[PDB]
Design a protein around this ligand. Structure first.
Ligand SMILES: OC[C@H]1O[C@@H](O[C@@H]2[C@H](O)[C@@H](O)[C@H](O[C@H]3[C@H](O)[C@@H](O)[C@H](O)O[C@@H]3CO)O[C@@H]2CO)[C@H](O)[C@@H](O)[C@@H]1O
Ligand SMILES: [Ca+2]
Ligand SMILES: [Ca+2]
Ligand SMILES: [Ca+2]
Length: 195
């Protein structure tokens, strides 16, 4: 399916900007197994970047396993050109950040990825920025996926939550991503002061 992404430019600090309250939560509902972990995320875009705000409810946080996706973490996938290829092209991105703000890339330049996390009672928040290589405009469509990895006290992933892919293959197959469509940038972006 498709998420419509509003235009805006948040501050990366792990805190919920005022402007994020003007955008809607996406609730990923594709669970690998039953768990009391759940998550939500908001998206926003500006001329230079896509922004993700994710909150995860997860009573046990673990990142003792040295394999990244075996820690409590979120993963963001982007098919920037909207090629929808079946394997990863040089513009396809797959990033991961754990609840301590440790970042990994499975695909794409990690210098494009900038994140903050915050520990919450019973969970964590991730606020992320991905620098875009193509100037986005109203109507731009990209492929996108969001995933949560749940780990437990044994230091292993026990479940995943996905927005769009129910097959376990987004890490190999961009055609499995959903779509985001960018809207809402005023054309006349010329703004006199007015105190
Ligand atoms: O027969 C089942 C076998 O599964 C193997 O595992 C792999 C592989 O080792 C991992 O690299 C891969 O990891 C990806 C996550 O599944 C995915 O959700 C995320 O987007 O991307 C991760 C980064 O690659 O996971 C699969 C497990 O599903 C086992 O290692 C074998 O022993 C098993 O037989
Ligand atoms: Ca913020
Ligand atoms: Ca692509
Ligand atoms: Ca956990």
């Amino acid at each position: 399916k498709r998420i419509y992404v509003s235009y805006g430019s948040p501050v990366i600090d792990g805190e919920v900007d005022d402007i994020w309250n003007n955008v809607e939560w996406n609730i990923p509902r594709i669970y690998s197994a039953t768990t009391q972990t759940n998550a939500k995320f908001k998206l926003m875009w500006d001329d230079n970047a896509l922004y993700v705000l994710a909150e995860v409810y997860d009573p046990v946080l673990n990142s003792a396993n040295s394999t990244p996706y075996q820690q409590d973490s979120v993963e963001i996938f982007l098919d920037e050109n909207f090629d929808r290829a079946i394997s990863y092209q040089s513009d396809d991105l797959h990033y991961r950040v754990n609840y301590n703000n440790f970042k990994t890339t499975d695909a794409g330049d990690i210098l494009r990825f900038y994140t903050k996390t915050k520990l919450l009672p019973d969970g964590y928040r991730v606020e992320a920025r991905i620098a875009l290589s193509k100037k986005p405009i109203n109507g731009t469509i990209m492929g996108f996926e969001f995933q949560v990895n749940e780990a437990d006290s044994s230091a292993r992933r026990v479940a995943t939550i996905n927005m769009f892919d129910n097959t376990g293959n987004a890490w190999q197959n961009p055609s499995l991503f959903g779509e985001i469509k960018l809207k809402g940038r005023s054309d006349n972006a010329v703004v006199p002061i007015n105190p």
